Amino acid sequence: SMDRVFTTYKLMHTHQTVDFVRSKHAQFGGFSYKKMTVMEAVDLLDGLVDESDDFPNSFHAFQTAEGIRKAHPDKDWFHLVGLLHDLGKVLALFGEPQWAVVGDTFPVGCRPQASVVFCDSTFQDNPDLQDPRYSTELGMYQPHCGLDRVLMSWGHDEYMYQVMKFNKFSLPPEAFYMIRFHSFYPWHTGRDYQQLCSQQDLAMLPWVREFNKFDLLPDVDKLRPYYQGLIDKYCPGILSW
Ligand SMILES: O=C1[C@@H](O)[C@H](O)[C@@H](O)[C@H](O)[C@@H]1O
Ligand SMILES: [Fe+3]
């Protein structure tokens, strides 16, 4: 598998510190990079190949949405979750390097656990891992705080979650959560990070695993009007990114 995939994660696991994530929350927390509609966001990602993997990520938006739609035909909000879920990748078009945008996510501020991809080979130069506040199992966290109180590595999950919240998308809470934690492989697949999750995360786990099935070229022009209706329904108009 790619040397580029490995290099993406090496850079990610070096530079994603507590300070770094906090800096990125400040940098993007104003939503003044762009005014654009959801469909513009989808089309912008025509010019993005995901280096943590090939085709444009935009096709993947439709593919995912259509996979969910086949399996859950009467659940329109869930089809849209498919379309929306990787649109935080617009960060890359905003000048962000891909280790700060794509890839599996992991909590910052506590020791990385075994199922964090390339855990053994990629954390050497992370400065946080010699800081006694962050080098331990729990790090800066209290036991069983819940994932919504964890500071995750920064990229397309928290970013899109924040875009949705700011713009007041009218999706159910499960839709927000799926998107926010869909890259958190160590938790939803590795079953790591049990020290941090709560009952609330246990309730959400079946939703995330169900979504992940469809995350893991279509005739996209024919699909546009349907997905436009869903956008009009759940997240209409020019949004702040
Ligand atoms: O959209 C994505 C891609 O970046 C995949 O390569 C990751 O493995 C996944 O964790 C993430 O959700
Ligand atoms: Fe993703």
Ligand SMILES: [Fe+3]
């Ligand atoms: Fe995806």
